[PDB]
Design a protein around this ligand. Structure first.
Ligand SMILES: CO[C@H](C)CNC(=O)c1c(C)[nH]c(/C=C2\C(=O)N=C3CC=C(C(=O)N[C@H](C)c4ccccc4)C=C32)c1C
Length: 502
Protein backbone atom coordinates (compact mmCIF):
# COMPACT_ATOMS: atom_id res chain seq x y z
CA UNK A 1 0.00 0.00 0.00
CA UNK A 2 3.03 2.26 -0.30
CA UNK A 3 4.19 4.39 -3.21
CA UNK A 4 5.95 2.36 -5.90
CA UNK A 5 9.13 4.49 -5.74
CA UNK A 6 9.18 4.62 -1.94
CA UNK A 7 12.56 2.87 -1.80
CA UNK A 8 14.03 5.95 -3.51
CA UNK A 9 12.15 8.49 -1.38
CA UNK A 10 13.45 6.84 1.81
CA UNK A 11 16.82 6.09 0.17
CA UNK A 12 19.60 6.46 2.72
CA UNK A 13 21.94 9.43 2.20
CA UNK A 14 25.65 8.81 2.00
CA UNK A 15 27.26 8.90 5.45
CA UNK A 16 29.23 11.94 4.30
CA UNK A 17 25.98 13.94 4.34
CA UNK A 18 25.64 13.35 8.10
CA UNK A 19 28.73 15.15 9.43
CA UNK A 20 26.65 18.17 10.50
CA UNK A 21 24.37 15.80 12.43
CA UNK A 22 27.11 13.75 14.13
CA UNK A 23 28.63 16.98 15.43
CA UNK A 24 25.50 18.34 17.14
CA UNK A 25 23.42 15.43 18.47
CA UNK A 26 23.74 14.91 22.21
CA UNK A 27 25.33 11.55 23.03
CA UNK A 28 22.81 10.82 25.77
CA UNK A 29 22.44 7.10 26.45
CA UNK A 30 18.79 7.01 27.56
CA UNK A 31 17.90 8.97 24.41
CA UNK A 32 19.99 7.32 21.69
CA UNK A 33 19.56 3.77 23.04
CA UNK A 34 16.10 3.62 24.66
CA UNK A 35 13.65 6.47 24.04
CA UNK A 36 14.36 6.76 20.29
CA UNK A 37 12.72 3.53 19.05
CA UNK A 38 15.14 3.14 16.13
CA UNK A 39 18.17 4.03 18.24
CA UNK A 40 17.10 1.35 20.71
CA UNK A 41 16.81 -1.28 17.97
CA UNK A 42 20.18 -0.32 16.48
CA UNK A 43 21.97 -0.49 19.83
CA UNK A 44 20.51 -3.94 20.51
CA UNK A 45 21.69 -5.00 17.05
CA UNK A 46 25.16 -3.79 18.05
CA UNK A 47 25.23 -5.92 21.21
CA UNK A 48 24.19 -8.96 19.14
CA UNK A 49 27.49 -8.93 17.24
CA UNK A 50 29.68 -9.13 20.35
CA UNK A 51 29.19 -12.36 22.33
CA UNK A 52 29.97 -10.43 25.52
CA UNK A 53 27.00 -8.07 25.38
CA UNK A 54 24.41 -10.47 23.91
CA UNK A 55 23.61 -11.93 27.33
CA UNK A 56 22.89 -8.51 28.85
CA UNK A 57 20.17 -7.59 26.34
CA UNK A 58 18.50 -10.97 26.84
CA UNK A 59 18.48 -10.58 30.63
CA UNK A 60 16.65 -7.25 30.46
CA UNK A 61 14.14 -8.79 28.04
CA UNK A 62 13.37 -11.51 30.59
CA UNK A 63 12.88 -8.91 33.32
CA UNK A 64 10.45 -6.98 31.12
CA UNK A 65 8.43 -10.19 30.85
CA UNK A 66 8.60 -10.64 34.62
CA UNK A 67 7.01 -7.30 35.56
CA UNK A 68 3.73 -8.32 33.88
CA UNK A 69 3.51 -12.01 34.82
CA UNK A 70 0.36 -12.85 36.82
CA UNK A 71 0.86 -12.91 40.58
CA UNK A 72 0.14 -16.63 40.95
CA UNK A 73 2.33 -17.53 37.94
CA UNK A 74 5.11 -15.27 39.26
CA UNK A 75 7.58 -17.13 41.50
CA UNK A 76 7.49 -19.92 38.92
CA UNK A 77 8.95 -17.36 36.52
CA UNK A 78 11.36 -15.84 39.03
CA UNK A 79 13.21 -19.11 39.51
CA UNK A 80 13.63 -19.56 35.75
CA UNK A 81 15.43 -16.21 35.49
CA UNK A 82 17.49 -16.99 38.60
CA UNK A 83 18.63 -20.29 37.04
CA UNK A 84 19.72 -18.90 33.66
CA UNK A 85 21.45 -15.51 33.87
CA UNK A 86 22.79 -15.50 37.43
CA UNK A 87 24.17 -18.97 38.19
CA UNK A 88 27.89 -19.70 38.61
CA UNK A 89 28.44 -21.42 35.25
CA UNK A 90 25.38 -20.27 33.30
CA UNK A 91 25.81 -19.99 29.52
CA UNK A 92 24.78 -16.31 29.57
CA UNK A 93 26.26 -15.48 32.99
CA UNK A 94 26.45 -11.71 33.43
CA UNK A 95 29.44 -10.45 35.41
CA UNK A 96 28.75 -6.84 36.42
CA UNK A 97 26.17 -8.19 38.89
CA UNK A 98 28.38 -8.28 41.97
CA UNK A 99 28.23 -11.53 43.94
CA UNK A 100 26.50 -9.41 46.58
CA UNK A 101 23.70 -8.39 44.21
CA UNK A 102 22.85 -11.98 43.25
CA UNK A 103 22.90 -13.07 46.90
CA UNK A 104 20.36 -10.39 47.86
CA UNK A 105 18.00 -11.47 45.06
CA UNK A 106 18.38 -15.25 45.44
CA UNK A 107 17.38 -14.82 49.09
CA UNK A 108 14.61 -12.37 48.14
CA UNK A 109 13.13 -15.24 46.12
CA UNK A 110 12.15 -16.98 49.36
CA UNK A 111 9.72 -14.24 50.41
CA UNK A 112 6.54 -13.09 48.62
CA UNK A 113 7.97 -12.71 45.09
CA UNK A 114 7.58 -9.10 43.97
CA UNK A 115 7.10 -7.75 40.46
CA UNK A 116 10.25 -5.60 40.78
CA UNK A 117 12.53 -8.28 42.24
CA UNK A 118 15.04 -7.63 39.45
CA UNK A 119 14.74 -3.83 39.50
CA UNK A 120 18.00 -3.63 41.47
CA UNK A 121 19.81 -5.97 39.07
CA UNK A 122 18.49 -4.27 35.93
CA UNK A 123 19.93 -0.88 36.89
CA UNK A 124 23.40 -2.36 37.38
CA UNK A 125 23.04 -3.73 33.84
CA UNK A 126 22.17 -0.39 32.23
CA UNK A 127 24.99 1.17 34.26
CA UNK A 128 27.48 -1.14 32.52
CA UNK A 129 26.04 -0.55 29.05
CA UNK A 130 25.83 3.21 29.64
CA UNK A 131 29.61 3.35 29.78
CA UNK A 132 31.96 1.03 27.93
CA UNK A 133 29.61 -0.65 25.39
CA UNK A 134 27.81 2.60 24.54
CA UNK A 135 30.98 4.45 23.56
CA UNK A 136 31.85 1.54 21.27
CA UNK A 137 28.45 1.81 19.57
CA UNK A 138 29.06 5.54 19.15
CA UNK A 139 32.15 4.64 17.09
CA UNK A 140 30.39 1.71 15.37
CA UNK A 141 28.77 1.46 11.95
CA UNK A 142 25.36 1.18 13.62
CA UNK A 143 25.53 4.74 14.94
CA UNK A 144 26.56 5.78 11.43
CA UNK A 145 23.35 4.03 10.30
CA UNK A 146 21.34 5.74 13.05
CA UNK A 147 22.62 9.09 11.77
CA UNK A 148 21.25 8.19 8.34
CA UNK A 149 17.77 7.49 9.75
CA UNK A 150 17.88 10.90 11.46
CA UNK A 151 18.70 12.59 8.15
CA UNK A 152 15.50 11.13 6.70
CA UNK A 153 13.51 12.11 9.80
CA UNK A 154 14.45 15.76 9.29
CA UNK A 155 13.58 15.98 5.58
CA UNK A 156 10.94 18.66 4.87
CA UNK A 157 7.28 17.64 5.03
CA UNK A 158 4.87 19.16 2.52
CA UNK A 159 1.45 18.50 0.98
CA UNK A 160 3.00 15.86 -1.29
CA UNK A 161 4.08 13.81 1.73
CA UNK A 162 0.42 13.02 2.48
CA UNK A 163 -2.65 11.91 0.54
CA UNK A 164 -6.08 13.28 1.45
CA UNK A 165 -8.79 10.60 1.36
CA UNK A 166 -12.13 11.66 2.88
CA UNK A 167 -13.76 13.92 5.46
CA UNK A 168 -13.80 11.53 8.41
CA UNK A 169 -14.89 14.04 11.02
CA UNK A 170 -15.65 17.77 11.10
CA UNK A 171 -16.36 20.68 13.42
CA UNK A 172 -14.67 23.55 15.21
CA UNK A 173 -12.38 25.96 13.38
CA UNK A 174 -11.54 23.34 10.77
CA UNK A 175 -12.15 19.80 9.59
CA UNK A 176 -10.80 16.33 10.36
CA UNK A 177 -9.61 14.51 7.24
CA UNK A 178 -8.25 10.94 7.13
CA UNK A 179 -4.87 11.46 5.46
CA UNK A 180 -2.22 8.87 4.54
CA UNK A 181 1.53 9.03 3.95
CA UNK A 182 2.23 8.07 0.34
CA UNK A 183 5.69 6.79 1.24
CA UNK A 184 4.83 4.22 3.93
CA UNK A 185 1.04 3.92 3.69
CA UNK A 186 0.39 4.69 7.36
CA UNK A 187 -3.02 6.18 8.10
CA UNK A 188 -3.54 9.32 10.18
CA UNK A 189 -6.22 11.92 10.95
CA UNK A 190 -5.42 15.43 9.71
CA UNK A 191 -6.69 18.35 11.83
CA UNK A 192 -6.77 20.98 9.09
CA UNK A 193 -7.22 24.43 10.63
CA UNK A 194 -8.50 27.34 8.54
CA UNK A 195 -5.79 29.97 8.07
CA UNK A 196 -8.14 32.99 8.14
CA UNK A 197 -10.46 32.34 11.10
CA UNK A 198 -7.43 31.98 13.38
CA UNK A 199 -6.37 35.47 12.30
CA UNK A 200 -9.72 37.08 13.11
CA UNK A 201 -10.04 35.10 16.35
CA UNK A 202 -6.49 36.27 17.22
CA UNK A 203 -6.14 32.87 18.88
CA UNK A 204 -2.76 32.08 17.36
CA UNK A 205 -1.54 31.30 20.88
CA UNK A 206 -4.01 28.51 21.67
CA UNK A 207 -3.32 27.05 18.21
CA UNK A 208 0.39 26.81 19.02
CA UNK A 209 -0.25 25.64 22.59
CA UNK A 210 -2.33 22.67 21.42
CA UNK A 211 0.37 21.68 18.92
CA UNK A 212 3.14 22.08 21.50
CA UNK A 213 1.31 20.03 24.13
CA UNK A 214 0.53 17.27 21.63
CA UNK A 215 4.16 17.23 20.49
CA UNK A 216 5.52 17.02 24.03
CA UNK A 217 3.32 14.20 25.34
CA UNK A 218 3.66 10.68 23.89
CA UNK A 219 1.10 8.52 25.69
CA UNK A 220 -0.66 5.33 24.67
CA UNK A 221 -3.94 6.86 25.92
CA UNK A 222 -3.79 10.33 24.33
CA UNK A 223 -3.76 11.21 20.63
CA UNK A 224 -0.19 11.74 19.42
CA UNK A 225 1.13 14.34 16.99
CA UNK A 226 3.42 13.02 14.25
CA UNK A 227 3.59 15.90 11.75
CA UNK A 228 2.99 19.66 11.78
CA UNK A 229 3.10 21.25 8.31
CA UNK A 230 1.72 24.47 6.87
CA UNK A 231 -0.08 24.50 3.53
CA UNK A 232 -1.93 26.90 1.24
CA UNK A 233 -4.35 28.72 3.55
CA UNK A 234 -4.19 26.11 6.30
CA UNK A 235 -2.02 24.82 9.19
CA UNK A 236 -2.30 21.08 9.74
CA UNK A 237 -1.85 18.59 12.57
CA UNK A 238 -1.46 14.88 11.76
CA UNK A 239 -2.92 12.90 14.66
CA UNK A 240 -3.69 9.31 15.62
CA UNK A 241 -6.62 7.96 13.61
CA UNK A 242 -9.45 6.49 15.70
CA UNK A 243 -11.95 4.25 13.91
CA UNK A 244 -14.10 2.93 16.74
CA UNK A 245 -16.51 5.72 17.59
CA UNK A 246 -16.60 7.80 20.76
CA UNK A 247 -17.49 6.70 24.28
CA UNK A 248 -20.68 8.77 24.23
CA UNK A 249 -21.99 6.62 21.38
CA UNK A 250 -21.35 3.35 23.21
CA UNK A 251 -23.07 4.47 26.43
CA UNK A 252 -26.45 5.41 24.92
CA UNK A 253 -26.76 4.18 21.33
CA UNK A 254 -25.01 0.84 21.88
CA UNK A 255 -25.67 -1.49 24.79
CA UNK A 256 -28.14 -0.63 27.54
CA UNK A 257 -27.97 2.99 28.77
CA UNK A 258 -24.62 2.37 30.47
CA UNK A 259 -22.12 -0.44 30.91
CA UNK A 260 -21.43 -3.12 33.50
CA UNK A 261 -19.07 -2.11 36.29
CA UNK A 262 -16.29 -4.39 35.03
CA UNK A 263 -16.50 -2.84 31.56
CA UNK A 264 -16.52 0.70 32.98
CA UNK A 265 -13.49 -0.22 35.12
CA UNK A 266 -11.39 -0.97 32.04
CA UNK A 267 -12.13 2.35 30.34
CA UNK A 268 -11.70 4.31 33.58
CA UNK A 269 -8.28 2.74 34.12
CA UNK A 270 -7.00 3.62 30.65
CA UNK A 271 -8.39 7.15 30.95
CA UNK A 272 -6.69 7.52 34.33
CA UNK A 273 -3.39 6.60 32.65
CA UNK A 274 -3.97 9.20 29.94
CA UNK A 275 -4.53 11.88 32.56
CA UNK A 276 -1.39 10.77 34.41
CA UNK A 277 0.72 11.09 31.26
CA UNK A 278 -0.58 14.66 30.85
CA UNK A 279 -0.08 15.65 34.50
CA UNK A 280 3.61 14.73 34.42
CA UNK A 281 3.90 17.81 32.19
CA UNK A 282 1.78 19.88 34.62
CA UNK A 283 -0.76 20.11 31.79
CA UNK A 284 -4.49 20.19 32.62
CA UNK A 285 -7.04 18.88 30.12
CA UNK A 286 -10.28 20.57 31.27
CA UNK A 287 -12.45 18.93 28.59
CA UNK A 288 -13.31 15.46 29.91
CA UNK A 289 -16.63 14.34 28.39
CA UNK A 290 -17.76 11.04 26.85
CA UNK A 291 -17.64 12.20 23.22
CA UNK A 292 -13.93 13.08 23.58
CA UNK A 293 -12.90 9.58 24.72
CA UNK A 294 -12.40 7.80 21.39
CA UNK A 295 -11.95 4.10 20.63
CA UNK A 296 -9.51 2.59 18.13
CA UNK A 297 -9.72 -0.52 15.95
CA UNK A 298 -8.69 -2.85 18.81
CA UNK A 299 -10.96 -1.54 21.57
CA UNK A 300 -8.64 0.83 23.44
CA UNK A 301 -9.22 4.49 24.20
CA UNK A 302 -7.45 7.80 23.70
CA UNK A 303 -8.25 11.34 24.87
CA UNK A 304 -8.90 13.53 21.85
CA UNK A 305 -9.77 17.24 22.07
CA UNK A 306 -6.91 19.12 23.74
CA UNK A 307 -8.02 22.52 22.41
CA UNK A 308 -8.91 23.53 25.98
CA UNK A 309 -5.65 22.31 27.53
CA UNK A 310 -2.89 24.48 28.98
CA UNK A 311 0.59 23.78 30.39
CA UNK A 312 0.59 25.12 33.95
CA UNK A 313 3.86 26.75 35.09
CA UNK A 314 5.05 24.71 38.06
CA UNK A 315 4.05 26.35 41.33
CA UNK A 316 1.48 28.68 39.73
CA UNK A 317 -2.25 28.43 39.05
CA UNK A 318 -4.66 29.45 36.27
CA UNK A 319 -8.08 31.10 36.09
CA UNK A 320 -9.89 30.07 32.90
CA UNK A 321 -13.63 29.46 33.21
CA UNK A 322 -14.01 27.21 30.15
CA UNK A 323 -15.38 23.79 29.27
CA UNK A 324 -18.82 22.29 28.67
CA UNK A 325 -21.93 22.87 30.77
CA UNK A 326 -22.37 19.88 33.05
CA UNK A 327 -18.71 18.78 33.02
CA UNK A 328 -17.24 21.84 34.78
CA UNK A 329 -15.68 21.31 38.19
CA UNK A 330 -17.12 23.62 40.88
CA UNK A 331 -13.86 25.58 41.21
CA UNK A 332 -14.02 26.31 37.47
CA UNK A 333 -17.63 27.52 37.67
CA UNK A 334 -16.73 29.81 40.59
CA UNK A 335 -13.98 31.29 38.38
CA UNK A 336 -11.28 30.53 40.95
CA UNK A 337 -7.62 29.61 40.63
CA UNK A 338 -7.06 25.89 40.17
CA UNK A 339 -4.45 23.37 39.09
CA UNK A 340 -4.98 19.83 37.80
CA UNK A 341 -8.00 19.17 40.01
CA UNK A 342 -10.74 19.72 37.36
CA UNK A 343 -9.56 16.59 35.53
CA UNK A 344 -10.26 14.41 38.59
CA UNK A 345 -13.74 15.90 38.89
CA UNK A 346 -14.14 15.07 35.21
CA UNK A 347 -12.99 11.49 35.75
CA UNK A 348 -15.68 11.06 38.41
CA UNK A 349 -18.33 12.25 35.98
CA UNK A 350 -17.23 9.64 33.43
CA UNK A 351 -17.15 6.72 35.88
CA UNK A 352 -20.58 7.64 37.23
CA UNK A 353 -22.07 8.11 33.76
CA UNK A 354 -20.69 4.84 32.37
CA UNK A 355 -22.23 2.84 35.22
CA UNK A 356 -25.54 4.66 35.76
CA UNK A 357 -26.27 5.57 32.14
CA UNK A 358 -26.82 9.25 32.93
CA UNK A 359 -25.05 12.34 34.21
CA UNK A 360 -24.79 12.67 38.01
CA UNK A 361 -26.40 16.15 37.93
CA UNK A 362 -28.76 15.78 34.94
CA UNK A 363 -31.34 13.10 34.25
CA UNK A 364 -31.08 11.57 30.81
CA UNK A 365 -34.84 12.25 30.60
CA UNK A 366 -34.86 15.65 32.35
CA UNK A 367 -35.22 19.11 30.79
CA UNK A 368 -33.48 21.80 32.85
CA UNK A 369 -31.95 25.19 32.10
CA UNK A 370 -28.19 25.52 32.45
CA UNK A 371 -28.44 27.65 35.59
CA UNK A 372 -30.11 24.91 37.64
CA UNK A 373 -27.60 22.35 36.36
CA UNK A 374 -24.79 24.46 37.82
CA UNK A 375 -26.45 25.03 41.21
CA UNK A 376 -26.75 21.26 41.60
CA UNK A 377 -22.99 20.90 41.09
CA UNK A 378 -22.31 23.49 43.79
CA UNK A 379 -24.95 22.38 46.33
CA UNK A 380 -26.68 19.02 45.85
CA UNK A 381 -25.16 15.65 46.72
CA UNK A 382 -25.36 13.04 43.97
CA UNK A 383 -27.18 9.75 44.57
CA UNK A 384 -26.19 6.20 43.65
CA UNK A 385 -27.98 2.93 42.93
CA UNK A 386 -27.48 -0.83 43.13
CA UNK A 387 -25.49 -0.65 39.89
CA UNK A 388 -22.56 0.57 42.01
CA UNK A 389 -20.57 -1.67 44.30
CA UNK A 390 -19.48 -0.15 47.60
CA UNK A 391 -16.08 0.43 45.99
CA UNK A 392 -17.70 2.07 42.96
CA UNK A 393 -19.72 4.50 45.09
CA UNK A 394 -16.63 5.31 47.17
CA UNK A 395 -14.36 6.39 44.32
CA UNK A 396 -17.11 8.39 42.60
CA UNK A 397 -18.09 10.57 45.56
CA UNK A 398 -14.37 10.86 46.35
CA UNK A 399 -13.59 12.19 42.87
CA UNK A 400 -16.80 14.27 42.94
CA UNK A 401 -15.80 16.09 46.14
CA UNK A 402 -16.90 19.72 45.86
CA UNK A 403 -13.88 21.00 47.83
CA UNK A 404 -10.99 20.60 45.39
CA UNK A 405 -8.51 20.08 48.25
CA UNK A 406 -10.16 16.96 49.69
CA UNK A 407 -10.71 15.54 46.20
CA UNK A 408 -8.99 12.25 45.41
CA UNK A 409 -5.96 12.72 43.19
CA UNK A 410 -5.56 16.45 43.92
CA UNK A 411 -2.88 15.83 46.57
CA UNK A 412 0.90 15.53 46.32
CA UNK A 413 0.62 11.83 45.41
CA UNK A 414 -1.24 12.37 42.14
CA UNK A 415 -2.59 9.57 39.98
CA UNK A 416 -0.94 7.02 42.28
CA UNK A 417 -3.52 7.79 44.99
CA UNK A 418 -6.26 6.88 42.49
CA UNK A 419 -4.72 3.59 41.34
CA UNK A 420 -4.57 2.55 45.00
CA UNK A 421 -8.31 3.02 45.47
CA UNK A 422 -10.18 -0.25 46.22
CA UNK A 423 -12.21 0.30 43.03
CA UNK A 424 -9.14 -0.84 41.05
CA UNK A 425 -8.37 -3.68 43.51
CA UNK A 426 -8.68 -6.20 40.65
CA UNK A 427 -6.85 -4.04 38.06
CA UNK A 428 -3.24 -4.89 37.18
CA UNK A 429 -2.12 -1.51 35.86
CA UNK A 430 1.31 -2.92 34.97
CA UNK A 431 -0.29 -5.31 32.48
CA UNK A 432 -2.69 -2.62 31.26
CA UNK A 433 0.09 -0.20 30.31
CA UNK A 434 1.76 -3.04 28.37
CA UNK A 435 -1.48 -3.70 26.50
CA UNK A 436 -1.96 -7.25 27.78
CA UNK A 437 -5.55 -6.90 29.04
CA UNK A 438 -8.17 -7.68 26.40
CA UNK A 439 -10.50 -4.71 25.79
CA UNK A 440 -14.15 -5.59 26.51
CA UNK A 441 -15.62 -4.44 23.17
CA UNK A 442 -13.90 -4.95 19.80
CA UNK A 443 -15.29 -2.62 17.10
CA UNK A 444 -15.97 -4.30 13.77
CA UNK A 445 -13.69 -2.88 11.04
CA UNK A 446 -16.54 -2.59 8.51
CA UNK A 447 -18.67 -0.56 10.95
CA UNK A 448 -19.41 3.17 10.83
CA UNK A 449 -19.72 4.70 14.32
CA UNK A 450 -21.60 7.88 13.44
CA UNK A 451 -1.34 39.13 4.50
CA UNK A 452 0.99 40.29 7.28
CA UNK A 453 4.58 39.62 8.32
CA UNK A 454 4.07 39.40 12.09
CA UNK A 455 2.42 36.06 11.29
CA UNK A 456 5.30 34.81 9.12
CA UNK A 457 7.11 34.39 12.44
CA UNK A 458 4.20 32.55 14.09
CA UNK A 459 3.98 30.22 11.09
CA UNK A 460 7.63 29.16 11.32
CA UNK A 461 7.38 28.19 15.00
CA UNK A 462 4.32 26.06 14.23
CA UNK A 463 5.26 24.15 11.07
CA UNK A 464 8.16 22.38 12.79
CA UNK A 465 7.85 19.18 10.75
CA UNK A 466 7.84 15.56 11.79
CA UNK A 467 7.94 14.49 15.44
CA UNK A 468 10.87 12.26 16.32
CA UNK A 469 9.40 9.40 18.36
CA UNK A 470 6.14 8.99 16.36
CA UNK A 471 8.03 9.14 13.05
CA UNK A 472 10.44 6.35 13.96
CA UNK A 473 7.59 4.15 15.21
CA UNK A 474 5.89 4.59 11.83
CA UNK A 475 9.01 3.36 10.04
CA UNK A 476 8.97 0.26 12.25
CA UNK A 477 5.23 -0.43 12.05
CA UNK A 478 5.19 -0.19 8.24
CA UNK A 479 8.20 -2.55 8.02
CA UNK A 480 10.10 0.11 6.05
CA UNK A 481 12.82 -0.17 8.72
CA UNK A 482 13.08 -3.97 8.49
CA UNK A 483 13.44 -3.69 4.71
CA UNK A 484 15.78 -0.72 4.27
CA UNK A 485 17.95 -1.48 7.35
CA UNK A 486 20.10 -3.87 5.32
CA UNK A 487 23.87 -4.08 5.74
CA UNK A 488 26.66 -5.85 3.87
CA UNK A 489 27.03 -9.60 3.38
CA UNK A 490 29.06 -11.40 6.06
CA UNK A 491 29.33 -8.36 8.31
CA UNK A 492 30.73 -5.86 5.82
CA UNK A 493 30.19 -2.15 5.34
CA UNK A 494 27.45 -1.38 2.78
CA UNK A 495 28.19 1.02 -0.08
CA UNK A 496 26.30 3.86 1.65
CA UNK A 497 28.45 3.57 4.81
CA UNK A 498 32.01 3.36 3.40
CA UNK A 499 33.63 6.74 2.77
CA UNK A 500 36.19 5.43 0.26
CA UNK A 501 33.90 5.79 -2.78
CA UNK A 502 30.81 8.04 -2.76
C1 LIG B 1 -20.33 8.60 9.39
O1 LIG B 1 -19.65 8.21 10.55
C2 LIG B 1 -18.25 8.19 10.45
C3 LIG B 1 -17.68 7.52 11.70
C4 LIG B 1 -17.73 9.62 10.34
N1 LIG B 1 -16.37 9.74 10.83
C5 LIG B 1 -16.13 10.22 12.19
O2 LIG B 1 -17.06 10.51 12.87
C6 LIG B 1 -14.71 10.38 12.74
C7 LIG B 1 -13.61 9.55 12.56
C8 LIG B 1 -13.57 8.24 11.78
N2 LIG B 1 -12.58 10.08 13.22
C9 LIG B 1 -12.94 11.20 13.81
C10 LIG B 1 -12.07 12.15 14.66
C11 LIG B 1 -10.86 11.88 15.12
C12 LIG B 1 -10.07 10.74 15.00
O3 LIG B 1 -10.33 9.74 14.42
N3 LIG B 1 -8.93 10.97 15.66
C13 LIG B 1 -8.95 12.22 16.21
C14 LIG B 1 -8.00 12.94 16.99
C15 LIG B 1 -8.29 14.23 17.43
C16 LIG B 1 -9.51 14.83 17.11
C17 LIG B 1 -9.85 16.24 17.58
O4 LIG B 1 -9.00 16.94 18.01
N4 LIG B 1 -11.22 16.73 17.48
C18 LIG B 1 -11.56 18.08 17.92
C19 LIG B 1 -12.96 18.08 18.53
C20 LIG B 1 -11.49 19.07 16.76
C21 LIG B 1 -11.62 20.42 17.02
C22 LIG B 1 -11.55 21.34 15.97
C23 LIG B 1 -11.36 20.89 14.68
C24 LIG B 1 -11.24 19.53 14.42
C25 LIG B 1 -11.30 18.62 15.47
C26 LIG B 1 -10.43 14.12 16.34
C27 LIG B 1 -10.14 12.81 15.89
C28 LIG B 1 -14.27 11.43 13.53
C29 LIG B 1 -15.10 12.62 14.00
Amino acid sequence: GKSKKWKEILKFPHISQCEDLRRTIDRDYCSLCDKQPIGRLLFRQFCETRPGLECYIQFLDSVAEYEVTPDEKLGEKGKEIMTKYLTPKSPVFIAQVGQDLVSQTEEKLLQKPCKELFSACAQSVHEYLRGEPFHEYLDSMFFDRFLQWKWLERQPVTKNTFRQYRVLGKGGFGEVCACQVRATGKMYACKRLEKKRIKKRKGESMALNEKQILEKVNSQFVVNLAYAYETKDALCLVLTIMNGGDLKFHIYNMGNPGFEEERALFYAAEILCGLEDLHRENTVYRNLKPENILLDDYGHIRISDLGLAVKIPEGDLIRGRVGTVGYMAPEVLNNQRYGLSPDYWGLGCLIYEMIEGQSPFRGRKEKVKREEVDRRVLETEEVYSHKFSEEAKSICKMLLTKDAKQRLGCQEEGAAEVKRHPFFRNMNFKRLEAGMLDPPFVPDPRAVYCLDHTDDDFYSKFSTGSVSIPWQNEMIETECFKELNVFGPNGTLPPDLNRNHP
